[PDB]
Design goal:
The structure is cut from a larger assembly and holds chains A (206 residues), B (123 residues), C (205 residues) and D (150 residues). The longest helix of chain A has 18 residues. In chain A, a hairpin with a 4-residue loop joins strand 7 and strand 8. Chain A has four helices and eight strands; from the N terminus they run βαββαβααββββ. Chain A is 26% helix and 24% strand. In chain A, the strands form two sheets. A four-stranded mixed β-sheet of chain A has the order 1-2-3-4, covered by helices on one side. Chain B has a single domain, classed as Beta Barrel (OB fold (Dihydrolipoamide Acetyltransferase, E2P)), CATH 2.40.50. In chain B, strands 1-4-5 form a three-stranded antiparallel β-sheet, with no helix packed on it. Chain B has a two-stranded antiparallel sheet with strand order 2-3. Chain C is an alpha+beta fold and 205 residues long. Chain C has two domains: 102 residues, Ribosomal Protein S4 Delta 41, Chain A, domain 1, CATH 1.10.1050.10; 87 residues, Structural Genomics Hypothetical 15.5 Kd Protein In mrcA-pckA Intergenic Region, Chain A. Chain C is 35% helix and 6% strand. The two termini of chain C are 28 Å apart. By secondary structure, chain D is of the alpha+beta class. In chain D, 23% of the residues lie in helices and 20% in strands. Chain D contains four helices and six strands. In chain D, the strands form two sheets. Chain D has a four-stranded antiparallel β-sheet with strand order 1-2-3-4. A two-stranded antiparallel ribbon of chain D has the order 5-6. The chains are: A alpha/beta (206), B mainly beta (123), C alpha+beta (205), D alpha+beta (150). Chain B binds four RNA strands through helix 1 and helix 2. Chain D: Pfam families: Ribosomal_S5, Ribosomal_S5_C. Chain D: One of its GO terms (molecular function) is rRNA binding. Chain D: One of its GO terms (cellular component) is cytosolic small ribosomal subunit. Chain D: This is Small ribosomal subunit protein uS5.
RNA sequence: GCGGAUUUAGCUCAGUUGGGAGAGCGCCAGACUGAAGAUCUGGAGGUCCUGUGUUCGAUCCACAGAAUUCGCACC
RNA sequence: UUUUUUUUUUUUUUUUUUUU
RNA sequence: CCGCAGAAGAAGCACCGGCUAACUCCGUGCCAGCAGCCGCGGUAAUACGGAGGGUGCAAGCGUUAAUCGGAAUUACUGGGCGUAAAGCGCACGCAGGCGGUUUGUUAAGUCAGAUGUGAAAUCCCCGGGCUCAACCUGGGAACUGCAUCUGAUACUGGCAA
RNA sequence: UACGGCCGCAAGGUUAAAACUCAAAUGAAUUGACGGGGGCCCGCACAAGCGGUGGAGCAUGUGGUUUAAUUCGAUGCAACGCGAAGAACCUUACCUGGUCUUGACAUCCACGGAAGUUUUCAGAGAUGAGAAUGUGCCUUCGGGAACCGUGAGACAGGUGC
């Protein structure tokens, strides 16, 4: 009956930031404003292998962009011509340069997010994804974790249908600010209305 | 849960209570139009519905509903009788399939097909 | 009166590799199973314990093309008969006239073969029995008549069945086109993928 | 390769001081295809957790039913408070025409020729309890032949 | 071949052969009230089945047509 | 097994679809 | 049956909840209305009432007058007495039901048989004649009882002890 | 429970029939209704007691007077000084009148513009009619900036519970 972030409340304790930067008194507004826009652009570039962690550092307002994706080799490009492009279009909004750094998602099966991006991809096939939903969780759980609970709310049937389903492939200590746990999301549609999946990945105890 | 109160109405929504007294033979019959009425103030403001009485030999007096469209259902006629006492009607315990004789019933209602017996329109 | 089509609409619910149209291009690539054959509810349909036998009466009713008439009038005597539901019923629909001629290859589709047999192009030992519920019992014979015996459609069957599994339960000639059932069909090798007892248990519900 | 099925459930959710309460239950059966059948109950805070706890209990030993070959040779009493109950074998060739209320407990072992529907009660719990507790009371061919020999 | 009565506000019907109308029920409403009722108030509803002519003026009349209906001329 | 500190308090309408 | 001439000449109703079975776009305000057990409508009506499509099936489709279905109930053949309903405060004797159980005996009922009835269309099985489904049928059987007798003895009743 | 009469001193006993009608429940076992129970308690519940609110006058919002005409929702424990902490420019209800329905605010292309300071007369405000004074930065003399335009197609919004 509660949804409860383990993440965000505990930045220094095994759960690092989505952004760590410093603006004084007057200079905060356009930084923050750009912090939605460069994020917007990056994820629609990355979606061909998603983005697990989207890490906006700002060493001097100018932006040390640090992007965890499953396949770097497609945003590197045929070697360097999309790394030019990105660094242009993420500096442009900010008015200041943006140093596009990659990282590789170290096996998508174990991740802070990519368990939700696997299940929400299936809703683009439009057929009965249920055949593949418990499966695609249990696969990723043979390659990592100790428990996971998964929730789907959305338009998942026909004509006027909106209902919500819940599933438990292991136990979940719900908040514990010491544990290795991750909370996260991802969002789909199916020509009728939203399908928004959420996760609690009890990876390990401490 | 005190069954004498509880049984009266409790959770069904068709609620089976129907009161259909009298027998003396069979329900599916011929019924003479005897004497017309349109009298009696009620809550359903029943308009143009001439609800008449029938000379059925059954141990008390009884009445019938007009059973379908077509305004002339005169006092000299003799139609067919059948069950279906809608909540609307006090006293009555039947309705009528009334296009026998000269009383006609459905006029040019193309939609009526197998429900009353009408022919095709312009395909 | 046996339904006529849209014939590939029957495949889009009766399922894969049906006889009704065996032969060319449509098979798999337009009967839309694994794609999404019923697009609107495709997201999360269901079944029923009774419904799943119902689609298998439907299998038998549409793959062989017989009326609700015949389903009752073959079951009528199947309470007198001595074997399983698969013998008593499903075998007969595999060896009624309009079906056995398809099986030997006198037509290319299991919906064409009925039209053929009502057109007086086939006989039973001489009998031009267009009454195509008439069922052809073992070691006595079914032939295309003279003036229809190699007639285009026949060779579009016989040159196309050549690459496929021909059953042993029946035997034919492919160059003068006549034959019979050499034994009774057997619920093992009858090659219909159906659970052959569902279609009489469906009466018990 | 064990076979693992539900049979019955409760809505089980009442008024109190105070608002409403609810629960999740299950009655399940398990088996092993050479002849072995069993049954188990459970509950949880959640739906599949109850089914889980119930099937985990259902996985216990499973009574080797006296089958020779596709079905069984005596009406062994399923004794309960009136169910009565007995089943009737059919002549090994026509199907499991049993009560869909309790058919599960014989299809988890593939018993292919046994019939009888829900005899004296319109409740699947009444018969599914009655059966497993009276199936343990079966006799082998060699036991009925000691009972009528040595 | 007769020609008479009833038809009125959404229903019932008072009563009306010329100055063109009437009560309760039901309907809606200003509040009290989450909405109603207790208490406390407000609005209507039609040119009397209708149409051509009368006539300074129609439900009314002359006159035709509709609905409820009547017994006799009907065979 | 003495258990009267006053008797009464109008109808509604709550009620998150559905096969499992 | 065999050549020309043309797919030519041959179909539709319930309806669409949920029962076997396909759903929505809209209407009128417990209006008008189906009313079988259920269920629908109390300005957001999945089938009331209109319409779009499609469905079950195809000389067919819903539904109706009765009554058993499913459902176990008048129970020699088939039964429930804490329940629906359910050993009636109570038993003076008059008829009636059960009359203690075995020997030597008996076969009327018991049971098996031989022979008669049930010519012909049964029910239940095959073989066939029409092109054939049907239809037209022929062949094979099973009929408790009752008859007339041959037996076999474990009961039912008797006979002597 | 009667409509023939078996008995009874009359009332009734006793057969338990039947006109017709119509839709399921009796039993468990589980509730806990806010509960001057037995019992455990406990809190200005109550104590012992302290200061008072009240009648007349004052600051004041509904009802209700009926005023020309009246704005919501406020009506015990889940509501008080409303939201409004300024209902006479006021974050505008509302009574109105004066403008509009891309409207005040904000874009993507099309042709073009340098941006503003100062009074005079009108007008209730929105807005109307004039008179003077001004001309910036890159500078490919290209493209535009600050920054103002008119003309295109797309196109703007609100405490509604």
């Amino acid at each position: 009956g509660q949804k409860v972030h383990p993440n965000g409340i505990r930045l220094g304790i095994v759960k690092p930031w989505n952004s760590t930067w410093f603006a004084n008194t007057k200079e905060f507004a356009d930084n923050l404003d750009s912090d939605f826009k460069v994020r917007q652009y990056l994820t629609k570039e990355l979606a061909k292998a998603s983005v697990s962690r989207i890490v906006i550092e700002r060493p001097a307002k100018s932006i040390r962009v640090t992007i965890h994706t499953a396949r770097p080799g497609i945003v590197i490009g045929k070697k360097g011509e999309d790394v030019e492009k990105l660094r242009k279009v993420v500096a442009d909004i900010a008015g200041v340069p943006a140093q596009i750094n990659i990282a590789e998602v170290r096996k998508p099966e174990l991740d802070a997010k990519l368990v939700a991006d696997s299940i929400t991809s299936q809703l683009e096939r439009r057929v009965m994804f249920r055949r593949a939903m418990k499966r695609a969780v249990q696969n990723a759980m043979r390659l990592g974790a100790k428990g996971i609970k998964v929730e789907v709310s959305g338009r998942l049937g026909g004509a006027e249908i909106a209902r919500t389903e819940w599933y438990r492939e292991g136990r979940v200590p719900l908040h514990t600010l010491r544990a290795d746990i991750d909370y996260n999301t991802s969002e789909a549609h199916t020509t009728y209305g939203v399908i928004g999946v959420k996760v609690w990945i009890f990876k390990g105890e401490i | 849960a005190t069954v004498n109160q509880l049984v009266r109405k409790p959770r069904a929504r068709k609620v089976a209570k129907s009161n259909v007294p009298a027998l003396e033979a069979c329900p599916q019959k011929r019924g003479v139009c005897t004497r017309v009425y349109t009298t009696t103030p009620k809550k359903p403001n029943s308009a143009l519905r001439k609800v008449c009485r029938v000379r059925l030999t059954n141990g008390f007096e009884v009445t019938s509903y007009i059973g379908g469209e077509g305004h002339n259902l005169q006092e000299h006629s003799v139609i067919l009788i059948r069950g279906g006492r809608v909540k609307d009607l006090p006293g009555v315990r039947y309705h009528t399939v009334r296009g026998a004789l000269d009383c006609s019933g459905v006029k040019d209602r193309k939609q009526a097909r197998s429900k009353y017996g009408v022919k095709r329109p312009k395909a | 009166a046996r339904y006529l089509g849209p014939k590939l609409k029957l495949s889009r619910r009766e399922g894969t590799d049906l006889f009704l149209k065996s032969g060319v291009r449509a098979i798999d690539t337009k009967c839309k199973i694994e794609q999404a054959p019923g697009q609107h509810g495709a997201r999360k349909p269901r079944l029923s314990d009774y419904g799943v036998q119902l689609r298998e009466k439907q299998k038998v009713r549409r793959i062989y093309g017989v009326l609700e008439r015949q389903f009752r009038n073959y079951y009528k005597e199947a309470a007198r008969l001595k074997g399983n539901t698969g013998e008593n019923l499903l075998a007969l629909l595999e060896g009624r006239l309009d079906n056995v001629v398809y099986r030997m290859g006198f037509g290319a589709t299991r919906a064409e073969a009925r039209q053929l047999v009502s057109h007086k192009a086939i006989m039973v030992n001489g009998r031009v029995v267009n009454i195509a519920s008439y069922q052809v019992s073992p070691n006595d014979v079914v032939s295309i008549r003279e003036k229809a015996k190699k007639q285009s459609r026949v060779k579009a069957a016989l040159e196309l069945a050549e690459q496929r599994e021909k059953p042993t339960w029946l035997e034919v000639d492919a160059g003068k086109m006549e034959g019979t059932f050499k034994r009774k069909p057997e619920r093992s090798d009858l090659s219909a993928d159906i659970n052959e007892h569902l279609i009489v248990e469906l009466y018990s519900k | 390769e064990l076979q693992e099925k539900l049979i019955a459930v409760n809505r089980v959710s009442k008024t109190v001081k105070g608002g409403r309460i609810f629960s999740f239950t299950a009655l399940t059966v398990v088996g092993d295809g050479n002849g072995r059948v069993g049954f188990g109950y459970g509950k949880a805070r959640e739906v599949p957790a109850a089914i889980q706890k119930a099937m985990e209990k259902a996985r216990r030993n499973m009574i080797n039913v006296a089958l020779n070959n596709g079905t069984l040779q005596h009406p062994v009493k399923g004794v309960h408070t009136g169910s009565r109950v007995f089943m009737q074998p059919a002549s090994e060739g026509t199907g499991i025409i049993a009560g869909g209320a309790m058919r599960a407990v014989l299809e988890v072992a593939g018993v292919h020729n046994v019939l009888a529907k829900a005899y004296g009660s319109t409740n699947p719990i009444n018969v599914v309890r009655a059966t497993i507790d009276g199936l343990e009371n079966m006799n082998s061919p060699e036991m009925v032949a000691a009972k009528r020999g040595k």
